[PDB]
Structures are given as C-alpha cells and as structure tokens.
Amino acid sequence: STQYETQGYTINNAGRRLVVDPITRIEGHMRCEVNINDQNVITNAVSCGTMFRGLEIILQGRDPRDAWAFVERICGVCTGVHALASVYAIEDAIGIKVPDNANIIRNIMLATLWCHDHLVHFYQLAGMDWIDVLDALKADPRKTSELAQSLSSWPKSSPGYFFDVQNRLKKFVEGGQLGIFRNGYWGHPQYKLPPEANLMGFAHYLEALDFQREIVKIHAVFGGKNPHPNWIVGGMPCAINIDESGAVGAVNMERLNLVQSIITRTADFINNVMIPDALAIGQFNKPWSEIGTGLSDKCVLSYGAFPDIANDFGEKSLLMPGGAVINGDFNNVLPVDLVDPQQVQEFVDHAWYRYPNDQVGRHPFDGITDPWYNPGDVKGSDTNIQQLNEQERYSWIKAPRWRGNAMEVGPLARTLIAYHKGDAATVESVDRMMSALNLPLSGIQSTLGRILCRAHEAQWAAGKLQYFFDKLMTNLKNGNLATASTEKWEPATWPTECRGVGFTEAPRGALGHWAAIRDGKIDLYQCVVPTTWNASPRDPKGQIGAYEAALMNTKMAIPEQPLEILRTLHSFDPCLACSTH
Template sequence: MTIQTPNGFSLDTSGKRIVVDPVTRIEGHMRCEVNVDSNNIIRNAVSTGTMWRGLEVILKGRDPRDAWAFVERICGVCTGCHALTSVRAVEDALQIKIPNNAFLIREIMAKVLQWHDHVVHFYHLHALDWVNPVNALKADPKATSVLQQSISAHSKSSPGYFRDVQNRLKKFVESGQLGIFKNGYWDNPAYLLPPEADLLAVTHYLEALDFQKEIVKVHTIFGGKNPHPNYLVGGVPCAINMDGDLAAGAPLNMERLNFVKLKLQEAFEFSQNVYVPDVIAIASFYKGWLYGGGLSGQNVMDYGDYEAIQGQKKTDRLPGGVILNGNWNEVHPIDPRNPDEVQEFVAHSWYTYGDANKDKGLHPWDGITDPQYVLGPNAKGTRTNIEAVDENAKYSWIKAPRWKGNAVEVGPLARYILAYAQGVDYVKGQVDEALGQFNTLAGTQLTAKQALPSTIGRTLARALEAHYCAKMFLDDFDHLIANIKAGDTSTANMEKWDPSTWPKEAKGVGTVAAPRGGLGHWIKIKDGRIENYQCVVPTTWNGGPRDPKGNIGAFEASLMNTPMQRPEEPVEILRTLHSFDPCLACSTHVMSEGGEELARVTVR
C-alpha cells in the first residue's frame, strides 16, 4: 500500500518489515520499524518512543523557584540545559532581569555543555556507525601519522603514538572482552574507511574519553557539580570574591577562574585540531552517501540563542527562525508565545485530549499530559511484547509538535542552515571552509545546500557548532573577567525572590539552543504555585509520530529512500538516527498525580 503524505513523502508499506528495538547508543528507549523494497531501499519508516516517565505533572502545585531542580533530571546527558530553560521561563513570567555576570556564567556553562555533549556524541555514540575499530588493527601507523598531519596540526601525530594505541587495541580485541565493540557489524560493506582512518578515529575516541571528564570541571566550579549543576532563579548561585580563598565560601576566585580559562582553551584546541578535522576526513570517504536529509532539506526551526549582549536579540550568534519548503531566501520569525505557532498533536501518540479534541493541536501553555495506551487494530503482538506497531493508530509515547501545522527538523543542522541562510559571517566562514576541505579530499564540488541536508551534514554541523561554542565561551569568559576587573561582582538579583512580590497570575516561556535542538519550557503560575508546566524538547520535534494530517516527523523522514547493504544488519538506520543524537528520556513524560503505578512493561 502506497500513501502520499502532505509533506511530500511517498510511503510504501508493502515491503519487508525490519524492526530495530531497542535503538542503542542513545538516551532512553526507542524503536524503529522500516519497510524495504526488493532492492533493500527504505520505503516506509516508523519511529516509536517506548519509554514513559514523569516530571511535568508532578510539578503542579510546587514552588516555581524549585522547578529547575526537577526538570534538570529529565536527562542525565544534556544535564543543565533543562535547568537553564526553566529559570528563563520563571524569570520571563516574573519579569526578573539577571546581572550581567550571571548571564555570562550561564552562557559559559551552556556552551561548555554544548561542546561536551557534541564531542561525546560523535566519538562515543555515533563514530562507530562510520568507524570500524577492528579494521584499525590492519593499519600502518606511519600512514596514519601522515593522514593526521595532512588534516590538522594536532600535537599527537607521531607513528609511535599511533602504534602504541594500536597495540592497546590489539590486546583489547585478543582478550575477547570487546565491551562496546561487541556485536558490531564489522564485516558489513557499509563501512568504507581504510584501516589508517579507522586507527586515527579510534585514537581520538580514546583522547576524547580522557578529555570529556576535564571539561565538565567548569560546571563543577560554576554550578557545584556535574551532571546536574546548580542554578538559581534570579542569577547563579556562585559568589565572586577575588580577594578570598575557597575556604571563605566564595567558589569563584582568581585561581578557579584561571583553571576555567585553561580548560576552555584546551577545549577550543581539541575541537579545532581533532574533532572538526576528523569529521571532515571521515566524511570524505563517504562522499557518495548523501542520504538521511529528510526534513532538513525542507523545513527547519530553532528559537535562536547565544546573545552577545544580554537582552539584545539582534546580536544573536545563532539567530533561529523557520525555513519552509527548502526556501533559504525566506526565514520566518518564530514566537513561542503565539498559540497558533507551536502546537502539540496526539492523534498518533499514546495520550488523549478527549474525543472532541483528538485531532486538535494544543499550545504548551494549555498542554495536557493524559496517557491513553491503546494498540492499533493492525498492530501485531501484545501490549507488553509488540511485534509491529500500527502507524495508522497511536504508536508512540512522544507527542507530535508542529510549527503552524508544519513538521520541522530541529538541531545543530537546523541552526546552521538558518544561520547560513541569514548570512551569519562566522557560520558562513566555517561551512564554506569545511566544505572546501571536504570537496578537496573527496574530489567533489558540492554546495552547502547540497551537502548540509544529509546525515553527513547533520554530523558536520554538530562539530562546527561545538567549535563555534568554544570560540564564544572564550569571548564570554573575557567579558566576565572585564566586568570583575571593573568592580562588578554581582551574580544574583533577589529583588523578586519573595512570592509576595509576584502577581497573582503569571506565565512565561524559556527557550535554549540545547545540544539536540530547540528546547522550550512553558510555565503558568497562580497564587505563587505552578498551575501548569510543559516541556517541548528537541527529540519531541524530531522523533514525534505522524500528525492528524499524516505528515511524518524528522526521524521518519530521514530514513526514507536510504539503501541498505544488509537489512538484517541495520548500520544505515543507526547511522542516520544517531546523527540526531536522540534523547527519548527528554521527550516522554507522564506520571499519575498520586504517583501510583499506571502500567508495567516487561522488556524481553
């Protein structure tokens, strides 16, 4: 059976059904089903969020000043971005302006999170979709050294260095304890790298593993700990005392700030000399694999973030907006307050808005989280052991957000397409330089509009954004030091801390450029307590199911028309889905008000 979706995708459900459950190396639990034709090309895709949990409902009736500490636990990977979004929403509702130092510290923390998340995503969650670590045993360390020196000025590039790593890897493989390398499809012809490139990538996998524990120390200094650093409505909880020591109770003195600067500089050098060059080099060996674009070639969205100066949106380093129908010449403004813009639908989600509103979209300020777990009439299996979902019915614990009725892709790729289309100089320079290097290595002549809307482009945009964040957090740090030198040590505004100063009713919205895309929290406050709280997270935008009109979301669209070498070894499915860095933990929230068990699912 062939179905034409309103957003331009032809779905054919007649071919062989392939099920990937669970999709691993992501945060949370996800299931993917595809239909492939006789040539093993994907002609239909279904993305299902299979995990359910709760934070939004349990916030009702609580103090809005505490909301950040609850919602921060939505995810253990992107840690502080939910807390930052939450305090922004509360401050928006109560009209609180934070001090410039608090703004800069928050910006540094957000960009450090972005950098860390992107590096961990590529090397430890996504690289193995492109890199064959077992094949690295065949590499010539001298040739790997030549490859390294040809793509960057990384200080660790000697043949002896790569030989030592290769020997470590050999012992690891020969021990029979492959750990995360176990059960890989290492003989699948979908892997295209030569052994020397595999050894290069595995070496940097280990380097990234070492450094990722260093960069998060910035969060422990500014926020007390990582994951889940501390935040504060009205500013940040860390005091500045340049004349004191840590024993005096102020976590920020000159010694701590110097340590932060060192880690920021090391991160900048890593993304410049390792991360970005690796992605470009690896991509050049996959030059013919420009699949996985999906919605990124049509509709992309982001709220915009990273103001250079607090409150001056015109100076956004990543300005956001919406592009529809692949028209880069027109960027639509986005207003998260407008009830006609951001809406969530549940026609194919395991929630209900009531029979009268089953096809209606709700703005998050009016959002409802009411579970309705019912398998469709054409589903196969049981409630606790689904063999195949029915995509014509409800099939996911993720809602389906839409912007003015349009399915859109969010994420670093969306932000970079929007910034490139709007002529942000730094972004244009990054993209053009990276694309020039790619074309030289690959022998191609691709333009940005040809290369970016793809799985490779999505992976490249994440690397470029990480390095852009490194540049920005160094700039933000310099501004923070300048403020302190000028005598400004304020880090919090407590004028409206007392609820007696609040209006009887208020509502606000906070948005953040989270690692996986545009993140929004909407809050309603009444009589000093939370009346309603809704999160619409990036994986909800990307991983949501069909809407009432039949439009498919970004995950599903990205898999369409992708050829598979061996459908029983779904490397290509994992490659594209991992490029989004799905976070199902973020995107599915439900719990009964009383906290009682709603259902029990047995995972076999």
C-alpha cells in the first residue's frame, strides 16, 4: 500500500477496499472503488468508465454534413448537445454563418435540453439519495400539505392528494414487488427529511416523471422528435411559413403557439416544484455544504454558451460565461482558447488507450483514439475484475487537463465562473440562495452546492427559453424568416483542408468537438465531453480528477451501503456514454 500527495490530498490505498459496480441512477456504465481508513473515511477514490463505443473512429470518412447525426448518439440523455457542437464545429471549419433564426432556434434547443435534463436528474437520478421514499409511508397527509403550502404556491398540495399518493405507494409495496425501490438505502442515518418532506418529495418525483415528457415537445416542433432531434449544417431544417400558402407544411403560427404553451408550463414547474424542493433539501441537509468540495475550490472551467449574436462566439455574445480558475484564485478568471495546444490536452497513461508516448498530453487536433484494454495487475483477471489497479490503466475515460491542471466542469463550475466575473443575476441568485440557508458562500463549493446550482440553472434556462422565443417572434414580426444558409452546402465550395472547433456548455459542463476536414470528408473527429473532465482518471503527475477529489476525505456511516459515495457522484450528474463516446 502506497501513499502520495496531490492537490492537498493524501492518496492512500491502505485499508478496506470498497467496490460499487454498477453505479446506478446515472447514464451508462461506471465503476467506483475507494479505500477507507479505520474511521470509515475515504483515503483513496477511483473513477472508472466501464464502456466504450468509439464514435471518434466511426466518424472518420463520413461526410461533414452527416457528422451531427452520428455524434448526437454519443448520448440520449444530453440528446441534441452533441449535434449542436457538431454543426458548430463543421461551420467553424468551413466558414459557414447561419441566419439569426437558426441561431435562436439552436439556443431554444439547448435551453430546452438544460430544463429537461436538469429536471429529470434532480428527481429521477439524484432524488432518491435525499428522499427516503419508504419513509413516506409514515407521513401525515395534512402535515405534508402544510409543509408544501409553506414552501410553494404550487397548486397540487391538498391533504387528499398527498393521501392518494401515499395510498398508491402503500398498495404498491403491499404487492411485495418494490421494483425500482427494492434493496435501496432506506432508513440510512444520512436520510434527514421528516416523513412529510419524504411524501412531498415522492409526490414531486411522480409529477416530474410525468411533466418532463412535455418539455421536449419543443424539440419535436423544431427538431422532429425527442430523443435525438434533427439539425443541419447551415442552420435548422424547420423552415418557417406564417402567412403564405403551404404554412401547414412548415413552422407556422399554430406550431409556435404550441411552443409558447410548453415554455410557460416548463417555467412554472421548475420555479414552483423543483426550486422549492432544492431549497428544502438544502435546509434539511446543511452538513452536505461541507462535504464533496473536491476541485470546486481549486480549479473550475467553463467554455461558455448560448451565443446571442448569431455566429459570434465571443465574450460579449455568450449569455453563459466562459473562463477558467486555477490554484483556488477566483480573483483571476482566465480566458480559454480551444485551439491553443498548451491548454486542453488529454492523457491516457491511466486509461485503456495507446499513445506513442503516454507521458504526454495531446490537444484534440493531435488526438488519438486507439483502444487498448490492459487493466494490468488487478485483483482477479482481465475478465473478472475484483479490484482495479489505479497505479496502472483503469478506465475507458481519457484524462483531460487545462494547462496541465485538473478541472471541475458543470453547473457549480459555471456558477463560480459567472459569479467571479461579476455577472449580476448570478451574484444575486447565489447570495440570496445561501442567505436563505443561513450558510456562508463557501457552502456552494460542495456536493449540496452542485445540486443547488443545477436547480438554479434550470430556472435560468426556463427564463432564457422565453427570451429566445421572443427574439424569434421579433424577427418574424420584421419579416425575417430565414432558417438555413446554403451558400456552402456543396462540398465543391469547401476548403480542401480545414479544421474547426464547436463548443458549448452541455447540462454537465464544457463540451468541445474538434474536427478536421480533408477532401470533403472527416479526417479527424475528437470529442472532449464534460463527464470526461469530471470522471477523469489520473495523469503522469498522479493528479486526481473532480470525482476522485470530491470523494476524498468523505465519512461513510455504513461502509457496505455507499450512500455518501452515491450522493457525491450523483451531484455531478455523471454521463458515462458521454465520457467515453
């Protein structure tokens, strides 16, 4: 057993080893291992992506116009975000400028995704870490009504409603078929909600499972379907016709009316169900504002997103700020350049990939994706891993670094970047939110903080949805209908050789696609995805990524039941298919 120091942590693989495989209530396949000391405190944490598909290999030789459709299938949870990054990358490479309405509709597609994804994460993925569903059976329906009405104006609060929800759960359990609730962590001492808050939470779990289906109707109108809507290089294919023959065949006033109706309902659900629930989880779990800090007080990264000026990806255009903090210096938000070879690099010394020199990091334009399953000296065998060997290669996830630094990405990262750049809305949201909880600002740099920032981002995005929709309608009032530029649709118009970067802020953090086009075909296509950053394995210096760092130093009440590990991992919203692609 060895010990070394990195980023303020003492990585120590003495003591009991615990394995959580599978990690559930995530997208895709993850394994996590830890070592705990004699006080049941984590002294070593190992993040492992347990899947790979090889989209970067598959994309070679494809028509650049087709690329979005392939890379969209990196992920059905963050569905659309990879299509957006792809059309951005291809447009950047060829030099295509899209019409304003295409840009606005793309922003609507992204905002819609932020709302949907964040909502489903809060309830269906992270929720059962905080809500003791089975304890809801002990709640008083009237006291549940009282609690709900104390927290929100949301209509659905009657005693009889909560009784009906409770009764439905009771009869469900009575069947002796607990389904998705079977063999959970119910009764664990870290469940702190009173029964009434558990019943309220569970009711909201169900309401959110229902409501989330409506949000993506916006994707259906502009993009055909959800999951996996359609896009084009040059804009969007959803041609607009308001006042001419054949408007029945296009985005018309009736289609726009449907979109408006969904926007209003989406804002209302998020503002009156999710936001109060997140604050309530905060109130009953304040100690988790001091757990799972990880890299969030050290190194955070955002590329920025939502260009409000069409075809302008600069700081004055992006509504979601970009920037990097390193060394815990939040007074110096540094600019990010995705073409600079000394900035974003990926290492594979601790990953299942071949490089000519695994001691160096490769910028994505020099990226290599050559799979090499070699887990080394595991406890077990190559096909029966009892314990990964984190001293060697232990993941299908590459290790991204920014100027050699290990970074956290995602809602909390974005909140901290915007806050420290002096975004007024963000400072106000964060101050008021932490005030309501009677916690210091530093409490946001935590597992609880990740959850609170995500919730607030859903509110932010629901607001932006209306703003974008209103900008679309303003263009239509002015007779500006264009949704595609076709000037450079034909391969004959393209440079023989060119390369481009497409970047955005996906629900889980900073996303980039790096594309090289040669002779009308994809020559290279490299993706670095938010969960790649967060779930990263170690690098040649032994530096740990965001997950490993957040898990370090964490107390477990009951080693056999990994509730604390789940809480922290889930707070990052892991997307493993994304991470590996």
